[PDB]
Amino acid sequence: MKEVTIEIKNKTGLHARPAALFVQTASKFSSQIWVEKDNKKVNAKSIMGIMSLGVSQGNVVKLSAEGDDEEEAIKALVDLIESKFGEE
DSSP, rough: EEEEEOOOSTTTTHHHHHHHHHHHHTTTTSSEEEEEEEEEETTHHHHHHHHHOOOOOOOOEEEEEEETTTTHHHHHHHHHHHHHHGGG
């Protein structure tokens, strides 16, 4: 299992296009992937799950992945987040 804690720094948090990019990126991997905030854990591949978490700019979340490509999955999501989903 691979886990990392990371601040979501883009304007919309995990909403709008960034939320779609997040779920699409997570979905490329066979691992089970989760996002957690404030004692609530959801499936990173689920748009309903991500929305239910209500992740806004500045919020810190814990990402975790379990499976054959767990390191790669986490690195992809970290890289996407650290690029602010392509936004300046």
